[PDB]
Amino acid sequence: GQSFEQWRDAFRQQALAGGIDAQTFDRAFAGVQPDPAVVEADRSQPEFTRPVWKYLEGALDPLRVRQGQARLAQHARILGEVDARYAVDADAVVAIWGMESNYGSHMGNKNVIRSLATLAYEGRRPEFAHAQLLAALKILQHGDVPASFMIGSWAGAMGQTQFIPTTHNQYAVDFDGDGKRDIWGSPGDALASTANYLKASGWIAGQPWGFEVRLPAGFDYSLAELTIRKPLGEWQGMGVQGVNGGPLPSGLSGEQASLLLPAGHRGPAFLVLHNFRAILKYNNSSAYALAVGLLADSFKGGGRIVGAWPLEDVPLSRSQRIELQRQLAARGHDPGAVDGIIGANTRKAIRACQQEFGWPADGYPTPALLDRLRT
Numbered sequence: 001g002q003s004f005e006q007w008r009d010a011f012r013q014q015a016l017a018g019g020i021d022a023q024t025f026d027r028a029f030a031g032v033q034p035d036p037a038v039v040e041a042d043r044s045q046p047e048f049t050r051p052v053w054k055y056l057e058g059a060l061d062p063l064r065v066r067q068g069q070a071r072l073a074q075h076a077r078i079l080g081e082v083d084a085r086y087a088v089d090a091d092a093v094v095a096i097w098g099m100e101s102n103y104g105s106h107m108g109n110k111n112v113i114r115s116l117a118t119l120a121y122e123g124r125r126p127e128f129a130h131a132q133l134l135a136a137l138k139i140l141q142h143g144d145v146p147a148s149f150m151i152g153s154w155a156g157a158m159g160q161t162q163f164i165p166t167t168h169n170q171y172a173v174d175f176d177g178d179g180k181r182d183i184w185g186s187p188g189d190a191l192a193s194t195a196n197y198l199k200a201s202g203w204i205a206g207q208p209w210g211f212e213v214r215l216p217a218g219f220d221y222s223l224a225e226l227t228i229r230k231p232l233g234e235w236q237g238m239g240v241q242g243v244n245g246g247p248l249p250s251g252l253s254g255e256q257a258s259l260l261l262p263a264g265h266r267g268p269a270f271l272v273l274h275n276f277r278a279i280l281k282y283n284n285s286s287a288y289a290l291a292v293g294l295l296a297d298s299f300k301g302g303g304r305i306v307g308a309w310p311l312e313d314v315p316l317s318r319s320q321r322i323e324l325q326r327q328l329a330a331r332g333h334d335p336g337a338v339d340g341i342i343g344a345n346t347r348k349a350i351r352a353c354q355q356e357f358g359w360p361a362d363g364y365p366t367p368a369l370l371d372r373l374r375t
């Protein structure tokens with residue numbers, strides 16, 4: 001509908017046809033109007049972003065580390081039962097909890113029905129919003145949480161776990177058995193739900209997410225791609241070493257790993273294993289997954305990085321990423337579509353251009369690359 005009420009009355013037909021009952025729908029939509037804050041967040045295309053080292057510095061703030069250590073102690077019994085029932089490490093569950101909602105203190109203060117209805121009505125991604133909105137109404141119908149307390153982010157990520165509704169409906173858990181999968185008010189349900197999702201995503205208990213390594217001179221930096229996986233044994237026989245020199249973790253020699261270079265060839269390097277891939281299913285950002293792994297390590301006194309971060313790491317702005325793609329294509333290094341997203345295709349083009357200049361081909365673009373391109 002053109003008006004929100006028109007859209008709502010029309011959607012009410014689809015909800016009824018989808019199994020939602022009248023009391024639930026009307027209860028859920030009582031007083032609901034579009035939220036301009038949600039529209040703005042949905043439209044937001046940030047010109048500037050922070051370098052990875054600053055993101056990590058925030059994620060690994062000692063205050064978050066110590067709060068996670070406090071949660072590990074406070075909820076030790078539950079975490080033990082969860083760690084044991086789902087075969088997922090407590091430290092990883094708690095790290096995700098820290099990264100997703102600050103252990104439940106920052107869930108958002110937006111009503112999920114209002115936010116998803118707003119996006120359905122006038123958002124850029126109405127298919128997603130409609131689907132999640134129907135899923136949310138089913139959660140209300142089942143009674144996991146009262147409508148008044150169904151809180152989450154502008155995009156519909158809910159509660160302590162920041163599950164979207166369809167993820168809640170497939171992976172949320174009722175830990176205590178009261179019949180409610182309450183990822184808003186129950187740490188037990190939240191922690192078990194997180195573990196269930198990590199396990200479904202392939203978590204292997206006790207296996208490292210990954211670790212920092214040292215690269216040899218003249219290394220083939222084109223190998224730094226999550227789609228490229230090699231047994232640790234193959235990486236070691238290739239020149240890769242433990243971060244302080246020497247061999248890599250034995251016993252794990254058969255495990256498949258990828259090389260991650262979050263700030264290019266001058267920055268630190270990590271080998272990341274299957275459990276890193278599991279974390280990516282929670283949030284598909286390598287920076288996020290690195291933060292989760294290092295935060296989990298930090299609880300036990302690890303998590304800090306031996307290799308120095310490049311001082312000159314000023315990330316390309318959004319318009320600069322678009323400019324980069326256009327400049328690459330102009331020199332015959334096709335990056336695919338010009339969308340401002342540095343994905344696999346663009347990294348391929350970047351590497352070809354770096355090689356043309358005689359630079360290490362790490363696929364990591366910098367202002368200096370853009371400056372060279374526009375001589």
Ligand SMILES: [Ca+2]
Pocket residue numbers: 173174175176177178179180181182186189
């Ligand atoms: Ca429960």
